[PDB]
Amino acid sequence: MTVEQMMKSGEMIRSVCLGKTKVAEELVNGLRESKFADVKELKCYVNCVMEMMQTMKKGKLNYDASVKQIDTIMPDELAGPMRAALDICRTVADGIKNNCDAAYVLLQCLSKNNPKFIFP
């Protein structure tokens, strides 16, 4: 995928998701700094992004789509550590019934376990 198209989609996804949840941008930017504030609309922003990316459905991790996406967006140097994160975190959100909470728990884990973590 082209940097052009990849940036475009990540922007698209951010646009859609900021639109649906009306979260403050600073909060969303906070995420890339591991500031995981317990804010309902920030949690649902995260869930929105994961649903858009096909990585989560009905608050459940669907694994192969995530690896595809990791490997497509990231170069090898980064995907290595990130697929690892997804493996370490594969069952971390099981039994979380609320979709937004489940997504947020997964993001926390991915960020804790991946030094090259990026998020739309």
The single residue listed with the structure tokens 């979260």 is 23
Query: Cα–Cα distance between 61 and 107 in angstroms, integer?
Result: 11
Report the alpha-carbon distance of residue 24 to residue 42 in Å, rounded: 8
10 Å CB burial of residue 4 (0-12, 13-18, 19+) is exposed
Q: In Å, what resolution does this model reach?
A: 2.0
Structural domains of the chain in order of their starting residue, each with its CATH number = 1-120 (1.10.238.20)
Residue 110 DSSP SS3: helix
* Cα separation values, 63 from 18, 30, 66, 90, Å: 25, 26, 5, 8
| 57 beta partners | 60
Amino acid, res. 81: P
Rounded to an integer, what distance in angstroms lies between the CA atom of residue 60 and that of residue 67?
A: 15
Helix (H, G, I), strand (E, B) or coil at 61: strand
Q: Determination technique for this PDB entry?
A: X-ray
